[PDB]
Amino acid sequence: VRLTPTMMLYSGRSQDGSHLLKSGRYLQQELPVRIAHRIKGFRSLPFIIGCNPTILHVHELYIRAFQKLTDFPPIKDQADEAQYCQLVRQLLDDHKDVVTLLAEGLRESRKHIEDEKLVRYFLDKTLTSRLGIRMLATHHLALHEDKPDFVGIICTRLSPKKIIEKWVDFARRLCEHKYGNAPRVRINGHVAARFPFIPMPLDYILPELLKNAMRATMESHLDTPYNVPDVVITIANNDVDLIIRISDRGGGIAHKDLDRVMDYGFGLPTSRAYAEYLGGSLQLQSLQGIGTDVYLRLRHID
């Protein structure tokens, strides 16, 4: 009992494993319908783009997914549900590179793009539906796990500070490897906050935002990489949403680039679409000559 947009994540308990069958049967009815919607998206692409060999390949993954899914017989016991999980697992892996295949197929296809609002809409709808589908699927699998402080993929006691720190260490390493240093990150605000929340969207978004804030900081301090401005992260936790402000002193996004930056890495426009999909937002405040403030808002689970 809990939801993403129009999709339900099951918070349940059954010592017989009754909840696993109910969740399995839900996932089994919901997946094919949503995969078919993805097939329609490909069908309605401008012909010339839909013809691109990589776009066509991704199109074919979805048909294949829909075939295997609809071919699976209904679930009438635990044993069915178990094998169904195996299928779902295989599909999640087969589809792991999809975002990357799309970004490539569409680049090969840049010249033939006449209407950009049309393709941008396709990407947003595809990528965000894909996310929802993957959360729902991953949730069901994670219900088989016995891990504490987790109901499926819902973490019952999530520390925004903690999950930010993990992605900071990650982004710092990439940055140190490329520039030989990385900005110290400071975290302020509600650093002690804990509340139920689904990690996954944060796991996509944060590393992107952290990579940008760090890149921009280094690219504008080439002369002094051993000494660069800190990246300052602020956490604001209230009853409606969680806000994570990420501020860098990297010189800002230039006026001429302001529009190009939020459109299709490819990490920012995806991140914004994810945030809105979940009922939040991703906004940018550029101080040209100084730095950039990025505001990630995500609604509280309920």
Ligand X SMILES: CC(C)C[C@H](Cl)C(=O)O
* Interface stretch with ligand X, choices 92-100, 154-162, 207-215, 292-300 (CB under 6 A): 92-100
d(CA 217, CA 248): 7
Counting contacts by CB under 8 A, is residue 285 touching its own copies?
yes
User: Which residues 98-157 are close enough to bind ligand X by CB under 6 A?
Assistant: 98, 130, 133-134, 137
Core vs surface per residue 256-283: b (16+ CB within 10 A) or e:
eeeeeeeebebebbbbbbbbebbebebe
Q: Which of 132, 152, 183, 252 binds its own copies (CB under 8 A)?
A: 252
Look at residue 100 and give the partner it binds from ligand X, its own copies, none, a contact being a CB closer than 5 to 8 Å depending on partner kind. Answer: none
Counting contacts by CB under 6 A, is residue 91 touching ligand X?
yes
Q: Which of 10, 23, 42, 95 binds ligand X (CB under 6 A)?
A: 95
Report whether 248 belongs to an annotated binding site. yes
Question: Which residue, 45 or 253, has its beta carbon nearer to its own copies?
Answer: 253
Counting contacts by CB under 8 A, is residue 241 touching its own copies?
yes
Report whether 98 belongs to an annotated binding site. no
> Under a CB-based contact definition with an 8 Å cutoff, are residues 216 and 250 in contact?
yes
Look at residue 3 and give the partner it binds from its own copies, ligand X, none, a contact being a CB closer than 5 to 8 Å depending on partner kind. Answer: none
Q: Which residue has its beta carbon closest to ligand X?
A: 95
- Nearest Cα to Cα of residue 126 among 109, 105, 108: 105
User: In the complex, what is the shortest distance from the CB of residue 123 to ligand X, in angstroms, rounded to a whole number?
Assistant: 13
Question: Which residue, 80 or 241, has its beta carbon nearer to its own copies?
Answer: 241
* Pairing relationship of beta strands 231-237 and 185-189 according to DSSP bridges: parallel
Q: Which of 36, 39, 56, 92 binds ligand X (CB under 6 A)?
A: 92
Counting contacts by CB under 8 A, is residue 237 touching its own copies?
yes
User: In the complex, what is the shortest distance from the CB of residue 91 to ligand X, in angstroms, rounded to a whole number?
Assistant: 4
Counting contacts by CB under 6 A, is residue 65 touching ligand X?
yes
Binding-site annotation: residue ranges for Mg(2+)? 212
Residues that bind its own copies (CB under 8 A): 189-190, 234, 236-238, 240-241, 243, 245, 252, 255, 283, 285, 287-291, 293, 295
Residues that bind ligand X (CB under 6 A): 35, 65, 91-92, 95, 98, 130, 133-134, 137
